[PDB]
Amino acid sequence: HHTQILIVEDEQNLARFLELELTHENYNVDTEYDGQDGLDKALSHYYDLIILDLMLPSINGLEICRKIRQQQSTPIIIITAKSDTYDKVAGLDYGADDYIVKPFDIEELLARIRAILRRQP
Numbered sequence: 001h002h003t004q005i006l007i008v009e010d011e012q013n014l015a016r017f018l019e020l021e022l023t024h025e026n027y028n029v030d031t032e033y034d035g036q037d038g039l040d041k042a043l044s045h046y047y048d049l050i051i052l053d054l055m056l057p058s059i060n061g062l063e064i065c066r067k068i069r070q071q072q073s074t075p076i077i078i079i080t081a082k083s084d085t086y087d088k089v090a091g092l093d094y095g096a097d098d099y100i101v102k103p104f105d106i107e108e109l110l111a112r113i114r115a116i117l118r119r120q121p
């Protein structure tokens with residue numbers, strides 16, 4: 001009944017902050033701090049939207065994005081300190097629906113989540 005979000009982010013302070021802020025907006029949030037654990041969770045459960053850090057232990061977020069896209073059209077937002085156009089283009093072309101440079105303001109993330117989920121059936 002709740003919208004379900006997965007966050008794969010190894011900086012645990014930010015992961016916890018995003019979880020709290022999204023929960024306050026009535027999302028249900030799962031978090032994983034390891035890239036392999038995050039991919040496994042994304043493939044084994046239905047999420048409405050997945051948020052992926054790029055520099056993660058075990059598996060990089062771009063590889064997580066690619067493996068998810070073999071199996072699912074689930075919306076993905078990449079969050080990362082990699083701000084070069086090269087990196088933005090790579091993430092989007094791997095299947096991400098949006099790409100936000102860290103550090104970012106929570107209100108922008110929430111607005112981009114709403115914009116993406118607006119179009120899902």
Ligand SMILES: [Mg+2]
Pocket residue numbers: 009010011053054055056
């Ligand atoms: Mg990281």
